[PDB]
């Protein structure tokens, strides 16, 4: 069947994308410290194929690690819009999930999901470096389940 072959190609491109996730070098607050510890020797996100790159144009993932303020919200959407697709967003910490400790502040966006779409929510204040690494591994398994080519074939 022709839907079997596309499913195998869909596996191939899915494998190529979850095995070469390149997060954007984008940190905001304390949650970025735990994002560095994921790159530190103990966890070494680089061994999973995850490499930080500074340019939004050379990134596949935006980890919103820290608080999002009304002054910073326009900048966050700009660097998100400039990421070539496919792009994924991982919300790290309570501040980026629903505002966290500063939910009722006049200068804090109550959740980064009000500005950009979100794929994985990592809870914690801050999440442990092992909790963020669990979130990135959940994102990879979420990319493994994509069936773009099996949906194109059935159109």
């Amino acid at each position: 069947r022709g839907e079997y072959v596309v499913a195998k190609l869909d596996d191939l491109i899915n494998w190529a994308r979850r095995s070469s996730l390149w997060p954007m070098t984008f940190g905001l607050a304390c949650c970025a410290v735990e994002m560095m510890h994921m790159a530190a020797p103990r966890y070494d996100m680089d061994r999973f194929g995850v490499v930080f790159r500074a340019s939004p144009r050379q990134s596949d993932v935006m980890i919103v690690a820290g608080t999002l303020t009304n002054k910073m919200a326009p900048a966050l959407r700009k660097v998100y819009d400039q990421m070539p697709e496919p792009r994924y967003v991982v919300s790290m910490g309570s501040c980026a999930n629903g505002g966290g400790y500063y939910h009722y502040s006049y200068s804090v966006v109550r959740g980064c999901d009000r500005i950009v779409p979100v794929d994985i929510y990592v809870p914690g204040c801050p999440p442990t470096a092992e909790a963020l690494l669990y979130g990135i591994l959940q994102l990879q398994k979420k990319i493994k389940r994509e069936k773009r080519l099996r949906i194109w074939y059935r159109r």
């Binding site: 070494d44 061994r47 144009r57 050379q58 070539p84």
Partner: protein, 318 residues
């Protein structure tokens, strides 16, 4: 049979470039108390495949402010000239046996800078422009010094033919009589390849991504592929110049094995150096190669023009 020969050259180069990315990521990892890629394939042997496929099925975008023709020409020019630097290399038999191989590589190297200048200018971004003008500054720093260093080493060899460097170093390596030139040549190749501590045209910590900040997806891959193919090529050039290998006409394979190892170890040193030193300032690089190397290079050019004459050791012309 010549088309096959070209394919037996460019295709292995790309595979070497692909797995030099893996080697760098793991070599730096262990020098940083890490492991590097060890999940995507056994010992990360499939990591280069995933990254290549990922980039070539990703969306490429032309900036609204870009000059489209220059934006697309530049990545083509970088990879096309990156592969062209290999055809005169004797390993031990070159693909294109040039009588002026040394000069051909100099001209091609200079022409390959414009892939950086035009990519940055065509991007129409301030960060791409700043990185492009660092390329102008960086090429003004080493180009004059790099030529005279080669000239001093060719005054012991005899001509500009690269195959003749194998004959020159048949009794002894050229690094013994010319280790002062070897030191200044090695640091000049780091500058020419835009490698740390002279990775200024890109400058992640200063310019985000430098000249290729706007490039994405496949077009970004060509710049990456060209940069690493240049590291290997320049380290092959260094081995041929100062670490010449003995050539047996009836066992040319033995040459390649010994010659291949010397290029890898010189290539590992580039990874070794990136993990050990901070980054220069692009004005301090100019002072390094104009106030330290250039005064000594001119003195060693006078010495190497007089030394053969005062010892009756002028090499043959042919």
């Amino acid at each position: 049979m010549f088309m096959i020969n070209i394919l037996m050259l460019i295709i292995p180069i790309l595979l070497a470039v692909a797995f030099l990315t893996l080697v760098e990521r793991k070599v730096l990892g262990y020098m940083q108390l890490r492991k590097g890629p060890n999940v995507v394939g056994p010992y990360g042997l499939l990591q280069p495949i995933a990254d290549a496929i990922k980039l070539f099925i990703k969306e490429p975008l032309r900036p609204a402010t870009s000059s489209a023709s220059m934006f697309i020409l530049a990545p083509i020019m970088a990879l096309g000239l990156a592969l062209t630097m290999w055809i005169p290399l004797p390993m031990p038999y070159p693909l294109i046996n040039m009588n002026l191989g040394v000069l051909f590589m100099l001209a091609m190297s200079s022409l390959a800078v414009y892939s950086i200048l035009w990519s940055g200018w065509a991007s129409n971004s301030k960060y791409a422009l700043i990185g492009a003008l660092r390329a102008v500054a960086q090429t003004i720093s080493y180009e004059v010094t790099l030529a005279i260093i080669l000239l001093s080493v060719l005054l012991m060899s005899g001509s500009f033919t690269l195959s003749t460097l194998i004959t020159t170093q048949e009794q002894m390596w050229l690094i013994l009589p010319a280790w002062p030139l070897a030191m200044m040549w090695f640091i000049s190749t780091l500058a020419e390849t835009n490698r740390a501590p002279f990775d200024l045209t890109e400058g992640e910590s200063e310019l985000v991504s430098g000249f290729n900040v706007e490039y994405a997806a496949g077009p970004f891959a060509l710049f990456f592929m060209a940069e690493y193919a240049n590291i290997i090529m320049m380290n092959i050039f260094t081995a041929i110049l100062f670490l010449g290998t003995s050539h047996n006409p009836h066992m040319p394979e033995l040459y390649t094995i010994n010659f291949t190892i010397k290029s890898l170890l010189l290539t590992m040193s580039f990874l070794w150096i990136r993990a050990s030193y901070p980054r220069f300032r692009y004005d301090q690089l100019m002072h390094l190669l104009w106030k330290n190397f250039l005064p000594l290079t001119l003195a060693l050019c006078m010495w190497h023009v007089s030394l053969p004459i005062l010892t009756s050791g002028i090499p043959p012309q042919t």
